[PDB]
Write a protein that binds this DNA or RNA. Structure first.
Lengths: 450, 456, 455, 450
RNA sequence: UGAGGUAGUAGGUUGUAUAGU
DNA sequence: AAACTATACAACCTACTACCTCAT
RNA sequence: UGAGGUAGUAGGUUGUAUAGU
DNA sequence: AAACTATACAACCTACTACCTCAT
């Protein structure tokens, strides 16, 4: 019965490296013999060294360092290891270990040249796993008879992943760019034709009172239904600006700066959306700065749009998905869309209290996950559209703005492996962990929720 | 159709010149650098506080396991992970009688009630540190449920702030934290479901105690010489109707895991109407002069390149005030970190969201970075639902976008109050909120300590 | 015919409830009572001071012998004696260059040099205590000898201005622990320790363990509710600044802990009347401080309070003392002095009186021979012939043998030095140090009451 | 059954370390056999050593010191230990201890080379730690720790010659009591018969000006030779007060209080001594607060008196001996005497600087002890005594004061033993430690000594 | 830990109560 | 001493920086 | 750590500069 | 408004309370 592991290193050097490897091996479930621990001072060495070399050991390990290169005990143990290796006919009996990088591959004695060296140079964890990968010293610990295997498997087999991997994967974002930007941004210098008490909110087309100018997107002869004062205004007074120069920043005039041009354009594109989206008869929930929009019961059939559910029911509340869009211009002509989710009690009116809404939102957070979010958002975007590749914006009676309904897609050079679905349960467990760590004045709303 | 160029996860140095990405697994494998000889713990509370504290420390003496070490690795017992001893004996106990607390409770003012408890706790540990003989390194204050609920301007900030002058390290532990067995509501479920994360609780508490002991748990992998990182706090002081302005501060990380953190000015300038959070030339000169002199103190040489982290945009007059105090060989870089920008990259097919380290570059002076998400080591997501990125901008200066991305991805791995793999914001801004809240809670502080054990 | 009565040598407790007589042998045999896990030492000084501290801190790792263990017991080692940890690693270090010292040495005011050098050390220590993260429990300061020979006390105002931040520190001279290469012009070490290395190691180790936070030894016989109030009468002396009476006080209650409070500056009786008769307000303030601190640290009222001083006590002060104290308790005042001469010579042989002899002249006044030959050490502590101390109790019903054995027990609680005994009781010994530190800076209003920040 | 720990070593060399190890081992529960605590004098040693080694010894501990490898006795003990460890066929019997860092590993004897010596060079605490864990790994039966037995043993063996005994020992003090005091005081109401500019110290006999009275110890006829106007004085105006009332504390009148009665008494005693020993013609020294005196060399025969040594010369400096007397009558009517030594250069004049005098006093202090001090004190008092039993004073042409030349002696109930002369040299070493623990501004006066 | 909540200001609009030449 | 029509700050019209809350 | 060295006053002596009815 | 003369503390006559340093 030979089941011991022999470690040979410089007496006063590598005591750390040896004692570490040494212990770690005894904690992994291996019987390991070392000078520092088992051969404590007060015992004889050489007779015992010969005894467990020729009777009890099964794997020989030498720590090759500059200090241990010419230490006498190291090559004495190496000579007895070579003798016992010839005795028990095992060409893999000596497993060398390398710690010192300053030495070359020929400075060590000729006994270590014949055999491969386990890479312990830059780090010791990969060296430990390379030592474990060796035959006759495999992951099976010393042929374990009875027990004490749960701790070691919990260490080794359940903590396998340490590095990364390379694979190509495709992600789609939440952004939606504008396809065909309109040619002309129109300014109407109404001057005395705009009453002082009139309100920009009321008109059915985008507009900004810019000093004495009204900066709109459509013609000047489409506001006839709300004031009869337009027909005295001639179109040659109104000025026109091509959007290419203000998109490229080339348009530099004292009237409107380039960043002021961008700010005006983004304000009217935001206004133009709400308007059309509102013209699409979809309901409306108040938010702090933007507005929330949700689908009511009875419009979407089967709770299925492109094989994706959008509405739902749990406990005694119905939940409706939604969005809130706001564009920008700096990286691309792109309109963003943010994901929102609004609940109700019977599908007609909303909750009276916002705290109930926030509580029920975070209650519904853990129920689903990323693919469901993407499915609901994409189904919402395709339901908002009427064509197949854009969205028709009711910007004017002649000019439409087309925005890419397909979200922008990117690709990644590096990725990871796809595991089973147990890690989703681990992520909901982590949600419960964040429940267990942070909490502040939660008693009153929990008591009042019933 | 563009690409997200990946940045490798930087490693953190451990003992014997070793590096591993996960601090929990690395601590369980190798251990910390400087071994302290042990800590003596002093506790203030009732008899139930002593019983719960002693039982919990006896429990964390022996090894304990979670549901799975995928998220939280094993806890091999305190001695087997840290190397120093902390047992039930030699614990200093300072009495708290419930009669005086109940007598003070009945007053109508919650403010005078908070004042008298903070006075009581400060008095107890000040006469502990000014006439007792036995050395107390870390003070563990425990509060029960009645005080925490019926006195709800918080305890922690003003406690630390009034303790700041005497330079005492202390740690506040709720009774809910370490007594989850019987912290039960009317239904029956524990409020603190710590049953499956006792390893996580032990890891966090032990790491905080060892950091407050005086030993460094882990350092950083690679810092180029002459480079220091400054994280500009702009914690909005909120004390009622005083002339308010701003109370900006900073965190410095140069060659270690220690942050020499100094106090910014009270801020009598740039009122909130012009509250775009800028520096006067005098105040900017003072700030960078303190940074340069601290670098000369702690490294005996002058820095080559200086980083500035912030949450708001910079200007030109602050920068030409800054540059008149820097030497001509130095380079200055400003970094803005935002969290409110919406950009969610969903995954077409798979069982996870977008992983950590995938960064989106749109220009040389600004780019996105995903510091939160999946990591192949931990095999789980630190986030919930879909993670949110952070937007990084270089407002002024000349540098490489990959370099600042690498530096921020390295800096987000130095959390010390919690033993977590990573966090969303960089730790220079994570520590910003608490250092500002502590320094702006008490008006009596003039020159505070720069070591970080008295804040977290 | 009159004889001399004997007081037995008092015992000092040790680890595991053990008692001995000599603290050095008991430390080598049993060890301290309450254990500390270790100490991280910090040093401020030049690189020569760092290498000298490392060479001693090392040397003291190894056992050091004396010529014999009868008087000078051997040093087994730091870990062997105290059961703690001390090494050459994890030592923080702050350096000082010689450009500033050479440039500023050529001034005309020596006190300005004392001020700016002490503030240099103080701000280095304070900055290290307030910015670095490594814990330091003791700070060891090395002073060069050029400023000692070319340039009121250094450590006095050093501890006084460090006292407002509560940091323990100790002062180590360069010739103390580097005496091998520090010789005069003739060629002999004027600080010669060729046989005395054991005493140096013992004293340094005991002081370091006391500043560590641990309790080396205590005294055993304590009846329920007895407190000794050693009243300082060291006279502050700062010229035209009205010194009057800056009396302080010690108290020993249940261990070797010394909880010293700040007595009032005392505008009563400016030094033209220095008879030290305390007015009722300040007297009751001092007694109330002692009684309230006893209530805090022991929860029970004192049955009997002893007062140690060096001058006589009159009636109005005692009546002021009595009213605040309740009806049950008893108060006694004891005067100790050295100036009274009575030397007793031995008829045959060449040895002195033995420690423990007592001479009684009345119920109120008596003598006590604290110093002399000791059977255990087989030598004498005193030089030439020992000089006794005159003990007299003013008024208050008590036994004279009790107070004699009480002061004899109190004599052995010296913590700065690892000696068998000193002459004066340790309350009056710490009196001078607490007075010198506390009246070197008026600018402090709530000083700490511990002992590690003073000795 | 064997349960005893054997320690072999050099008795007069490793005694300390061996005592420490034996006391720690007997305090930690292991019963230990050693030649310090057990092998006292008067016993046959070798047969007991062999019997305990080969009958009841389970482990052997040999100290490998510089003196522990050439002495014959440790070699013989190691030889019989080798014989018994060969009989038991156990290799865990001889446990070497090496305590000298100067000892190299190749000088050690052959039976100690094979076993690795336990380290005791750098430190002893972890050496005891590894000895203890090796012992508990070797499964030696142990007893529960009981340090009380160690306390009893340490009191028994190491405190034999160092404990006080019960014998009567006689001591003599420096106190000399008056046997005869003048019975009355003489208060002289001279009033106008004295000048206002009269200094009372110029009289031949003690007196003190006191309001309208002149207190003295002599009659009115004494002052005739110096004051011509005193011949008209009438003695009935003078008042007399019995000294028995004053010394017994039963006199308290409105005129003179008892406190001032005693103060006047002690004043006349003090300057009566001063004037008396001026009349002896012994030279004076200007002491800071008292009056110091010294006897000129060349007067006493052979520099001797009753075979005693009083004056001398050490290094071109004649040092003299002298006493100072101050009356104190608080416990008893006793005249005090305090000793001071005075240094002269040529035996006539005195050293100009008092620093030289202080340095010479402290330099010559250590060379003798209280035997010489008692001899010199008795010599000076016997010389000052013109009489044989007491001192004939000079306070009055008639009334005198007689204080005996022998001091009051007291005896003690318990004392110690008398050792050899090593103790006085060790007290000289105590003076050396008093040098080594305190020093202040010694440079200038040490440089001025040459 | 991140998504919803309130106060209210980055930086240009036009309504108050004076004064530039 | 007073004619024409702008000033002098400056409150306020759609929007971006922060502190506080709820809950897994 | 102890013995000489030194400024200054207990506490009731007798010289400065009044004022009391 | 003024005879006697001690007054009301006060400067100081020999020796008690603490310091402080010189070296063993």
């Amino acid at each position: 019965m030979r089941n011991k592991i022999f470690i040979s290193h410089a007496t006063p050097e590598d005591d750390d490296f040896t004692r570490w490897l040494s212990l770690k091996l005894i904690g992994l479930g291996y019987e390991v013999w070392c000078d520092i621990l088992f051969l404590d001072k007060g015992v004889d060495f050489w007779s015992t060294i010969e005894k467990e070399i020729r009777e009890n050991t099964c794997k020989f390990l030498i720590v090759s360092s500059t200090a241990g290169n010419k230490r006498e005990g190291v090559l004495k143990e190496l000579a007895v290891a070579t003798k016992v290796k010839k005795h028990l006919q095992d060409d893999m009996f000596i497993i060398p270990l390398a710690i010192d990088e300053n030495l070359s591959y020929d400075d060590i004695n000729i006994e270590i040249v014949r055999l491969n060296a386990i890479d312990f140079k830059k780090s010791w964890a990969k060296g430990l796993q390379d030592l474990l990968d060796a035959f006759e010293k495999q992951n099976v610990p010393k042929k374990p008879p009875d027990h004490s295997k749960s701790n070691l498997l919990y260490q080794q087999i359940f903590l396998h992943d340490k590095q990364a991997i390379e694979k190509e994967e495709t992600y789609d974002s939440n952004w939606f760019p504008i396809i065909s930007f309109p040619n002309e941004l129109r300014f109407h210098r109404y001057d005395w034709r705009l009453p002082k008490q009139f309100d920009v909110r009321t008109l059915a087309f985008p507009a900004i009172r810019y000093k004495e100018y009204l900066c709109t997107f459509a013609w000047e002869y489409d506001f006839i239904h709300q004031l009869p004062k337009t027909e005295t205004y001639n179109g040659q007074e109104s000025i026109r600006i091509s959007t290419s120069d203000i998109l490229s920043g080339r348009y530099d005039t004292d009237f409107i700066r380039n960043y002021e041009c961008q700010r005006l354009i983004v304000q009217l594109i935001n206004k133009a959306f709400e308007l059309r989206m509102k013209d699409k008869n979809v309901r409306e929930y108040q938010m702090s700065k933007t507005f929330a929009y949700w689908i009511e019961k009875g419009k979407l059939e089967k709770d299925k749009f492109e094989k994706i559910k959008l509405v739902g029911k749990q406990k005694n509340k119905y939940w409706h998905f939604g969005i809130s869009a706001a564009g920008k211009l700096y990286p691309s002509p792109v309109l963003m869309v943010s994901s929102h989710i609004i609940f109700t009690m019977d599908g007609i009116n909303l909750i009276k209290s916002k705290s109930i809404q926030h509580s029920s939102r975070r209650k519904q957070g853990k129920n689903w996950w990323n693919d469901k979010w993407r499915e609901k958002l994409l189904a919402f975007i395709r339901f908002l559209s009427d064509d197949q590749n854009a969205i028709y914006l009711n910007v004017g009676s002649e000019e439409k703005i087309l925005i890419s309904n397909k979200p922008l897609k990117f690709f990644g050079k590096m990725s990871y492996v796809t595991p089973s679905e147990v890690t989703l349960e681990e992520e909901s467990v982590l949600a419960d962990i964040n429940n267990f760590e942070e909490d502040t004045e939660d008693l009153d709303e929990l008591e009042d929720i019933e | 159709m563009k690409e997200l160029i990946y940045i490798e996860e930087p490693s953190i140095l451990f003992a014997h010149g070793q590096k591993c990405t996960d601090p929990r697994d690395g601590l369980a494998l190798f251990g910390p650098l400087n071994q302290i000889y042990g800590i003596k713990s002093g506790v203030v509370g009732t008899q139930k506080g002593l019983q719960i504290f002693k039982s919990y420390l006896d429990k964390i003496q022996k090894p304990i396991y979670n549901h799975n070490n995928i998220t939280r690795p094993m806890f091999p017992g305190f001695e087997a992970v840290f190397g120093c001893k902390w047992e039930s004996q030699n614990i200093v106990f300072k009495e708290i009688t419930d009669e005086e607390i109940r007598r003070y409770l009945f007053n109508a003012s919650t403010h005078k009630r908070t004042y008298d408890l903070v006075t009581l706790f400060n008095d107890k540990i000040i006469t502990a540190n000014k006439n007792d003989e036995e050395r107390v390194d870390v003070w563990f204050v425990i509060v029960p449920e009645e005080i925490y609920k019926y006195c709800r301007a918080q305890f922690h900030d003003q406690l630390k702030a009034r303790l700041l002058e005497h330079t005492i390290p202390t740690q506040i532990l709720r009774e809910s934290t370490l007594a989850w067995r019987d912290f039960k509501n009317t239904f029956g479920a524990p409020i603190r479901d710590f049953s499956k994360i006792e390893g996580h609780l032990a890891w966090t508490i032990s790491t905080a105690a060892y950091y407050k002991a005086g030993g460094k748990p882990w350092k950083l992998g690679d810092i180029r010489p002459g480079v220091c990182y400054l994280g500009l706090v702009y914690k909005k002081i909120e004390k009622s109707k005083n002339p308010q302005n701003a109370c900006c501060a900073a965190q410095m990380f140069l060659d270690n895991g220690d942050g020499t953190v100094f106090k910014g000015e009270v801020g009598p300038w740039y009122n909130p109407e012009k509250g775009e959070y800028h520096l006067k030339p005098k105040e900017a000169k003072a700030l960078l002069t303190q940074a340069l002199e601290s670098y000369k103190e702690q490294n005996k040489s002058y820095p080559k390149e200086v980083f500035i982290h912030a949450r708001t945009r910079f200007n030109d007059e602050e920068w030409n005030a800054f540059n008149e105090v820097t030497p001509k060989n130095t380079n200055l870089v400003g970094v803005t970190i935002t969290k409110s920008k919406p950009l969610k990259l969903y995954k077409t097919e798979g069982a996870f969201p977008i992983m950590r380290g995938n960064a989106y570059i749109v220009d040389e002076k600004k780019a996105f970075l995903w510091t939160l998400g999946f990591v192949p080591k931990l095999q789980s997501t630190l986030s919930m639902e879909v993670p949110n990125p952070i937007f990084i901008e270089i407002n002024k200066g000349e540098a490489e976008i990959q370099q600042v991305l690498k530096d921020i991805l390295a800096l987000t791995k130095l959390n010390y109050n919690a033993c977590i793999y990573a966090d969303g914001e960089p730790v220079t801004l994570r520590f910003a909120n608490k250092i500002g809240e502590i320094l702006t809670a008490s008006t009596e502080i003039k020159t505070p300590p720069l070591a970080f054990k008295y804040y977290i």
